[PDB]
Ligand binder design. Structure first.
Ligand SMILES: *[C@@H]1O[C@H](CO)[C@@H](O)[C@H](O)[C@H]1NC(C)=O
Ligand SMILES: *[C@@H]1O[C@H](CO)[C@@H](O)[C@H](O)[C@H]1NC(C)=O
Ligand SMILES: *[C@@H]1O[C@H](CO)[C@@H](O)[C@H](O)[C@H]1NC(C)=O
Ligand SMILES: *[C@@H]1O[C@H](CO)[C@@H](O)[C@H](O)[C@H]1NC(C)=O
Ligand SMILES: *[C@@H]1O[C@H](CO)[C@@H](O)[C@H](O)[C@H]1NC(C)=O
Ligand SMILES: *[C@@H]1O[C@H](CO)[C@@H](O)[C@H](O)[C@H]1NC(C)=O
Ligand SMILES: *[C@@H]1O[C@H](CO)[C@@H](O)[C@H](O)[C@H]1NC(C)=O
Ligand SMILES: *[C@@H]1O[C@H](CO)[C@@H](O)[C@H](O)[C@H]1NC(C)=O
Ligand SMILES: *[C@@H]1O[C@H](CO)[C@@H](O)[C@H](O)[C@H]1NC(C)=O
Ligand SMILES: *[C@@H]1O[C@H](CO)[C@@H](O)[C@H](O)[C@H]1NC(C)=O
Ligand SMILES: *[C@@H]1O[C@H](CO)[C@@H](O)[C@H](O)[C@H]1NC(C)=O
Lengths: 202, 191
């Protein structure tokens, strides 16, 4: 492999950096960063020893070059936007022998916000379990009771965030549910269990 | 905000070809590289470093020309294009303003050797020998025809058509040969 690059999954409205490491003897002349588009790629910035850093008017106050060098280059979005999400290429231009690309793709996330409403009445209980994240999170019930009444609804925001709300209506904590009622929420392959118990006495 | 241009160029065999870089002032440019990938040969480069006016070439054996002038980008030239010239040519210009590209798919065209003549029992023959791409043979008016295509190793194709018309009120026919290098209609007088 010629160019070493890692895709980056970082948080929305915060700093994100892409890096390419060119592995070869031949010193390049100029490095170009482009945003992969349908139609032609878009020119973002170049670094050269002869001309230094040159950012296109479009990206003027949105990125800088964090690593100045012909072998190792990094670009940094100061504060990301959904627009900034996508695929990028670092081009190493060397005299006398074509060029070499490195594609690195950027994906932005929003950490989940979870609401847990528990509501207890005559013997029976209803739990609603809401979760808003980006990408959409996965709600599931681990304090199973096989039967029960239960419905899940989702909403997509103009934000880009996705809300999922699961309403579970227990009728009696006997054979209905164990000693813990679990709302388990998966977010990009990561499950966190939200556990709810109940201690009486005698 | 154009940064890339893909183009298919068709050239008659034996005729001139001229390939142009992305259109940018030579004082502006930093590095200009032509990348040639010919049928059955590896990738290949002619490079020009603007500031020091130096060049380097992996491209020997491809039989093409690199035309240079002061204060203009270099261009590729081929006086008389051959079959082995078929392939991919790409000028890669880079300026401080970023990377630019002009890709070319060069396809060589061979005009078919066309022969035509009348025949025994009100028949006719019409042939377009080793053209590229294959030509198409029609007739006017429609007769009892059999038309066949043979492919040659050098990517040329021969198309042969023979027709009969039974005895009535038709005595003149037309072989119509369609091809990119130009269509033609040939007349025949039936035996
Ligand atoms: C990023 O920019 C947004 C405006 O779109 C602003 O609301 C937010 O506070 C900024 N955050 C940081 C960490 O710079
Ligand atoms: C980022 O680049 C701009 C040029 O658009 C320059 O004004 C600024 O000094 C740079 N900032 C940093 C932190 O390097
Ligand atoms: C490029 O990156 C490597 C590690 O990724 C770093 O150690 C090195 O300093 C850089 N190369 C050069 C020639 O500076
Ligand atoms: C809880 O339960 C009652 C039925 O017992 C139902 O009518 C009500 O809509 C539920 N409340 C919520 C907030 O889901
Ligand atoms: C959710 O509802 C379905 C039927 O609509 C049922 O099969 C399932 O058991 C319920 N989930 C739980 C945890 O009881
Ligand atoms: C995103 O903004 C919408 C308003 O469009 C809001 O309802 C939603 O809850 C927000 N989510 C976050 C995590 O800010
Ligand atoms: C030729 O044209 C398209 C659109 O300009 C471009 O995306 C593509 O990369 C080119 N095709 C190839 C095979 O390089
Ligand atoms: C190109 O390079 C060759 C060999 O290195 C040199 O002799 C020649 O002067 C150069 N010519 C041009 C036009 O750049
Ligand atoms: C180039 O020309 C030489 C004659 O010197 C010929 O042998 C060779 O086949 C040609 N190569 C191509 C790719 O046309
Ligand atoms: C291509 O092959 C056919 C059949 O051998 C021949 O007639 C034609 O002239 C060949 N060569 C070229 C250079 O077109
Ligand atoms: C040949 O005929 C086709 C239709 O069969 C027509 O579109 C085209 O104009 C003709 N070719 C030339 C070179 O005139």
């Amino acid at each position: 492999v010629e160019v070493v690059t890692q895709d980056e999954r970082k948080a929305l409205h915060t700093t994100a950096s892409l890096r390419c490491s060119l592995k070869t003897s031949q010193e390049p002349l100029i490095v170009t960063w482009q945003k992969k588009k349908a139609v032609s790629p878009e020119n973002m910035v170049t670094y050269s020893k002869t001309h230094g850093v040159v950012i296109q008017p479009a990206y003027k106050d949105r990125i800088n070059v964090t690593e100045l060098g012909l072998w190792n280059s990094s670009i940094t979005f100061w504060n990301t936007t959904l627009e900034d999400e996508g695929c990028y290429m670092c081009l190493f231009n060397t005299f006398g022998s074509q060029k070499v690309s490195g594609t690195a793709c950027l994906t932005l996330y929003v950490q989940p916000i979870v609401h847990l409403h528990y509501n207890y009445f005559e013997d029976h209980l209803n739990i609603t379990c809401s979760a808003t994240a980006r990408p959409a999170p996965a709600i599931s019930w681990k304090g199973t009771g096989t039967g029960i009444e239960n419905s899940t609804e989702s909403h997509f925001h103009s934000n880009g965030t996705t809300s999922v709300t699961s309403i579970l209506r227990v009728k009696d904590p006997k054979t209905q549910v164990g000693k813990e009622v679990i709302c388990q929420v998966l977010y990009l392959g990561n499950v966190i269990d939200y556990k709810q118990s109940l201690d009486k006495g005698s | 905000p154009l940064t890339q241009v893909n183009t298919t160029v068709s050239v008659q065999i034996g005729t001139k070809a001229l390939l142009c870089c992305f259109s940018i002032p030579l004082t502006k440019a930093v590095l200009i590289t032509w990348i040639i990938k010919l049928r059955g040969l590896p990738s290949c480069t002619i490079a020009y470093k603007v500031d020091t006016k130096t060049n380097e070439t992996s491209c020997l054996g491809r039989n093409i020309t690199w035309a240079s002038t002061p204060d203009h980008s270099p261009e590729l030239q081929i006086s008389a294009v051959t079959l082995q010239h078929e392939g991919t040519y790409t000028c890669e210009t880079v300026t401080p303003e970023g990377n630019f590209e002009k890709n070319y798919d060069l396809q060589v065209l061979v005009p078919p050797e066309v022969t035509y003549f009348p025949e025994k029992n009100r028949s006719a023959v019409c042939e377009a020998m080793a053209g590229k791409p294959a030509a198409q043979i029609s007739w006017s008016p429609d007769g009892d025809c059999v038309t066949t295509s043979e492919s040659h190793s050098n990517g040329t194709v021969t198309v042969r058509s023979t027709c009969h018309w039974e005895q009535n009120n038709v005595s003149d026919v037309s072989c119509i040969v369609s091809h990119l290098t130009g269509n033609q209609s040939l007349s025949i007088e039936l035996g």
